[model samples]
Target chain A: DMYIERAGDITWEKDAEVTGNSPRLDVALDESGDFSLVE
Target chain B: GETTDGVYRVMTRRLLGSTQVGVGVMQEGVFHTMWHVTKGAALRSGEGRLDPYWGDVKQDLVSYCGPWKLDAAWDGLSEVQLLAVPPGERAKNIQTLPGIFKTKDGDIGAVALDYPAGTSGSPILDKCGRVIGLYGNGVVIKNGSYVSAITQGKRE
Candidate 1:
């Protein structure tokens, strides 16, 4: 239950190089996708 | 069952071998649910299957009671022995833990109850079988919000 305190939802957008198409995910990734499972 | 986007079946199939069953319950999106031990109750956890590796099949007779509770109503009913704090563990993906942990895990002494949605009345049952108040199923809510059924125990 302690892990809940450390986690929060958020998002970000950045302009960069040309954007191609890769529909791997239905949702867009706006920020860091890594999340620790061991916590 | 595969969706257009390759979304694998979210249904639980272990119970329904060939049937592509859907876990329609709202808990599918919820994670971080913790199953704990209750006093005076027996608890066991494990994982396995049947096939050539499955081997012989024997009735668990005990833990296989939750989903089969409905059957008791038709099968003599008196044979069914309803447990107090029902036995079973919650299963969830590792992804949902963070949110669940943050939510209040109120103390064991908290009072809890089932919410009223469609019935126009509440789920709380008093000694006279009456609805009392609205209570959320939480730990701090003493007695907790869970209800166990023994098809033979209660009259329908």
Candidate 2:
């Protein structure tokens, strides 16, 4: 198991934007009213 | 059959076609085991009707057994011991890695983290010390605050 220095929790807020420095997310809600993911 | 990682064990049931009938994983290596039966286990057992997919099925209790060689060391935590760890510090205990959420339809999508919540699996114990629940994507949160959620293993 690799060390993951615990970035943080994902926000359920509207118009939320995450980056590499933020909580690593597989998918997030985007303004388009559909789901978006980091690929 | 056990998955490559030995963490997941997969069983198939014959129906209109072969599909996952029973699903389970080792709780603590050879010491304990837990499994779920619903869409997959039902079909394999020769019960429950199927039209195409696992049409309108009911979920069943996740079974458990054994303390293995670590008997005294393997008791489920009481309410008090669970709250000792701070919620903010819980996620740090879980290690997330890149993986996929393999769907029954044979669709594989990139799952952000390999946390338990990412899969439709059960809660994992941290050497009988703490109970960890899956959070969004790959992070796991300590479930002490939500007693019922961990106890029931479902939403309130």
Candidate 3:
């Protein structure tokens, strides 16, 4: 949880939609922070 | 443009009390936030000098090249008027170009799509409305940009 790299490009064989539990989230963690997913 | 809940902004906090900003997809279950960069990011000043994407400093720093960090998911993007429950698209089919980019691994997300200068870390979503690739300033070309390929929480 200290240092991590940025995400890469779509290394998938075929373009596949990320189905499953990933739905548009709308809950800003902190009132002054910048993030909304992970709920 | 700014930060929101659906398509949130990915921020990088480095040492010396400075920070950077980029786009990201907020996914659930897995606490991974993907953004704009090939390798990971370096926090310190000395070691993070040669970093290609986030070279130690922002614009200049002798030389920058090192690790990277960023992750995201899919959501509000569906709010783009595309009436497909899991909102999706087949992005220009820009994923197949002879002039695409290739790394030691293989074809990376090097795109030719021109945009504003400050518009570096914007989200490059694929047809299925998923964050397919990252628009690294260099590693970019038509259908050749570095694909983040983050599906269901696994990536290359």
Best-fitting candidate, measured by DockQ? Answer: 2
Per-residue lDDT over B1-156 for candidate 3, one digit per residue giving the tens place of the 0 to 100 score: 111123322334443442334333323312223222322443232233222232322211111232222333333233111111111212222332212223333332223344332233444444454554334234222343222211222232
Residues A1-39 of candidate 2: C-alpha lDDT, one tens digit per residue: 000111222112222222111122343333321233344
B1-156 per-residue lDDT for model 2 (tens digits):
111212222233334443322223333422111222332222111232211121111112232322222122112221111111122223222222223322222312222222232123322333343333312222232431111111212311
Fnat measured on candidate 1: 0.00
lDDT, model 2, position A30: 30
TM-score of chain B of 1: 0.15
CA lDDT of each prediction against the hidden true structure: 0.16, 0.24, 0.29
Per-candidate TM-scores read 0.14, 0.24, 0.32
Considering DockQ, which of the candidate structures 2 and 3 is the better prediction for this target? 2
Write the number of the candidate with greater TM-score, choosing between 2 and 3: 3
Q: Which ten residues in a row are the worst by lDDT in model 1 chain B? A: B92-101
As for DockQ, the candidate ahead, 1 or 2, is: 2
User: How does candidate 1 fare on TM-score?
Assistant: 0.14
TM-score of chain A of 2: 0.24
The TM-score between candidate 3 and the true structure equals 0.32
